[PDB]
Amino acid sequence: SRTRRETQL
Amino acid sequence: SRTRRETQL
Amino acid sequence: RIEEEELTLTILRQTGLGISIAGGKGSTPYKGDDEGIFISRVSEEGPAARAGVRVGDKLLEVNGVALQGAEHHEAVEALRGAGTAVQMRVWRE
Amino acid sequence: RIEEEELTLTILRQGGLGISIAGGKGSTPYKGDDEGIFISRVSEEGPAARAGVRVGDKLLEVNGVALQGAEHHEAVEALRGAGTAVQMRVWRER
Numbered sequence A, B: 001s002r003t004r005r006e007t008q009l
Numbered sequence C: 001r002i003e004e005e006e007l008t009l010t011i012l013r014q015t016g017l018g019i020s021i022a023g024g025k026g027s028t029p030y031k032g033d034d035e036g037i038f039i040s041r042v043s044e045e046g047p048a049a050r051a052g053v054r055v056g057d058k059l060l061e062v063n064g065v066a067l068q069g070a071e072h073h074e075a076v077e078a079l080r081g082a083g084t085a086v087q088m089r090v091w092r093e
Numbered sequence D: 001r002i003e004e005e006e007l008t009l010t011i012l013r014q015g016g017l018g019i020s021i022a023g024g025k026g027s028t029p030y031k032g033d034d035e036g037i038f039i040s041r042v043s044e045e046g047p048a049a050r051a052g053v054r055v056g057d058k059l060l061e062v063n064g065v066a067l068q069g070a071e072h073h074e075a076v077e078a079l080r081g082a083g084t085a086v087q088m089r090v091w092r093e094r
């Protein structure tokens, strides 16, 4: 019940 | 390189 | 931490608890880099086993005492002075 | 945390680190109950791969910025403003 966060850098 | 600690309760 | 996934088990202390804990801040981690308090042993005939406690459970609170980031002795003292009923919430899975 | 076992890797940016990060305080954990910042992807042709960065590494510091218990955006901002040389402290299992 959370936000999955993934960021390409 | 730490102290391993285990306690029976 | 994942509080939405945690379990609460109540151990009725025997006139002990039938467990062993390991780990803690500054101690050799029970697994990986996790310095949390873990259940390292569960007596098959003890109250913890019948109450649903299992090896590998991470211990996060005992009767209101928060154990997130706690030292080993803090968990021991919290469990030793908990009383006849030891309400501990753990995380597994 | 096991700081005595951590690694320090320096990425020499050519924009473009060649990684993806995942996790963070309050986000969906990358593994188990660990809310840390993890390297979720490493480009074979990017500078991070050349600097010794690997998928699964836990990111703990970036150019002095402590990321232990940090939110996802805090790591992103630390990495985007790191500069030409990105000194990262990581922990991996061995």
Ligand SMILES: OC[C@H]1O[C@@H](O)[C@@H](O)[C@@H](O)[C@H]1O
Binding pocket: C031, C032, C033, C034, D031, D032, D033, D034
């Ligand atoms: O799966 C959870 C466990 O993974 C292990 O790898 C530890 O590093 C730590 O993340 C622990 O909670």
Ligand SMILES: [N+]
Binding pocket: A005, D072, D073
């Ligand atoms: N974010």
